[PDB]
Design a protein around this ligand. Structure first.
Ligand SMILES: C=CCCCCCCCCCO[C@@H]1[C@@H](O)[C@@H](O)O[C@H](CO)[C@H]1O
Length: 447
């Protein structure tokens, strides 16, 4: 219930993230519209904006990896302030050359969110139920996206400026709630700096029990593992020289990369404008809305199954969904385009695909990315995994856009291939961490 509240704050952060994703999707769609219309400055400003935001997201993720060592909650507050100031300065829209740096810092804050949130949620909750709360994180991401989309609905441009203004209010709510209600950092990091009693206190607050014994012992084992890592001078590059460390790191990075390879949002947005079949634009908007609603409403059964079944199994079922969705899509689109059956199949299979991909892939990916890494090397590995996540995010977004301009068959069949390979990968190289202790892995024993 209390952990539910901490997770609620991190879910305000996730809400901001979701909004940023959605307004980025509307931005790209608008730019593409005007680009189809026309013939220099537009492409330049757009390219600079997207590039700056994206590299800002990646660098922001790496620098989030470096910053999260200073504090998790402090990082969250830095995020809130960043999004506050940036959203304000962008919503003003008086300054012409400031908007670029605004997009840059915005991306920075976004990456900061990406790295910071799942760790904070994972370390602030119960060992068994941490997953469900990670699913709550993803849930408020999707909720943020949906809220933004539905909020979309020279005066309408001022309304758009208001759309730019809203994140300032949301961030302000986040700052207020967080600072006022909870001043406590994670028990893990409290015990990391050498402070035992504060960690024990906040742990007593979380577990709602005077006995912190077993969790305190786990955290103690983690800290001792960190000190032992400091004794041998273990680092990221040093982890690359040891087969086990590079094994689990490669597993994580490739897992996240395969999560991005699915090409979810890109498929949603590209296929949304791909086959209109001369249907009303209102029907297209409705398609996008019900797709987002589908994302959320399928986001909840994610918490259901993660609570019940486990980690890897759900991933397998999701890969099944994506496969069954993409294969007939690939075949039918390979046959002929501009066909009714091809269009309907594309839409329905897209629905099944987004349901399954959300409910299976998203939360489980983030949570497992948090859990799979040992306390010896965790933050750097996860941060680099998110870095690879954003790189693969670009590798998905832009080339899938140029290819969907070229022809859909390529994108569909390569996404299908990457999906099957994702199934085989998750089944073969990944083990279930369910009921796992903090800072441990099923792959490696002690030292
Ligand atoms: C139409 C889109 C315009 C181009 C967008 C460029 C910014 C990249 C967005 C990264 C999306 O990544 C999310 C992923 O991290 C996961 O949390 O789930 C989400 C879905 O639920 C994924 O969209």
């Amino acid at each position: 219930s209390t952990s539910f509240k901490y997770v609620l704050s991190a879910c305000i952060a996730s809400f901001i993230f979701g909004y940023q994703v959605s307004v980025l999707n509307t931005i790209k769609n608008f730019i593409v519209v005007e680009f189809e219309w026309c013939c220099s400055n537009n492409t330049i400003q757009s390219s600079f904006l997207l590039a700056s935001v994206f590299i800002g997201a990646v660098l922001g993720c790496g620098f989030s990896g470096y910053l999260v060592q200073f504090g998790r909650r402090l990082s969250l507050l830095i995020i809130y302030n960043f999004f506050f100031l940036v959203s304000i300065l962008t919503s003003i829209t008086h300054h012409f050359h400031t908007i670029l740096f605004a997009r840059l810092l915005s991306g920075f804050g976004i990456g900061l969110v990406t790295v910071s949130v799942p760790m904070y949620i994972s370390e602030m909750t119960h060992k068994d139920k941490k997953g469900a709360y990670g699913v709550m994180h993803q849930l408020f991401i999707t909720f943020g996206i949906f809220v933004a989309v539905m909020l979309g609905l020279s005066f309408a441009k001022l309304w758009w400026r208001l759309m730019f203004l809203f994140p300032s209010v949301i961030s302000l709510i986040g700052i207020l709630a967080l600072v006022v209600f909870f001043k406590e950092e994670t028990p893990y990091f409290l015990f990391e700096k050498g402070r035992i009693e504060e960690s024990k206190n906040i742990l007593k607050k979380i577990y709602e029990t005077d006995n912190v014994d077993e969790p305190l012992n786990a955290i103690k084992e983690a800290v001792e593992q960190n000190e032992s890592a400091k004794k041998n001078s273990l680092s990221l590059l040093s982890a690359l020289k040891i087969p086990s460390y590079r094994y689990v790191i490669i597993l994580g990075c490739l897992l996240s990369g395969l999560q991005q390879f699915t090409g979810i949002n890109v498929l949603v947005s590209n296929s949304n404008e791909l086959y209109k079949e001369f249907l009303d634009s209102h029907l297209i908007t409705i398609l996008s809305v019900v797709m987002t609603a589908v994302n959320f409403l399928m986001t909840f059964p994610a918490i259901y199954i993660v609570e019940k079944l486990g980690r890897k199994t759900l991933l397998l079922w999701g890969c099944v969904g994506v496969l069954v969705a993409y294969l007939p899509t690939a075949i039918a689109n390979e046959i002929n385009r501009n066909s009714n059956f091809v269009k309907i199949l594309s839409i329905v299979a897209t629905f099944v695909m987004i349901i399954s991909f959300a409910v299976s892939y998203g939360p489980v990916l983030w949570i497992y990315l948090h859990e799979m890494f040992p306390s010896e090397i965790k933050d750097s590995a996860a941060s680099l995994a998110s870095l690879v996540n954003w790189v693969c995010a670009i590798i998905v977004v832009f080339p899938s856009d140029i290819i969907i301009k070229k022809s859909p068959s390529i994108l569909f069949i390569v996404f299908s291939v990457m999906s099957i390979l994702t199934f085989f990968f998750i089944f073969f190289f990944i083990k279930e961490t369910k009921g796992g202790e903090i800072g441990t892995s099923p792959y490696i024993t002690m030292e």
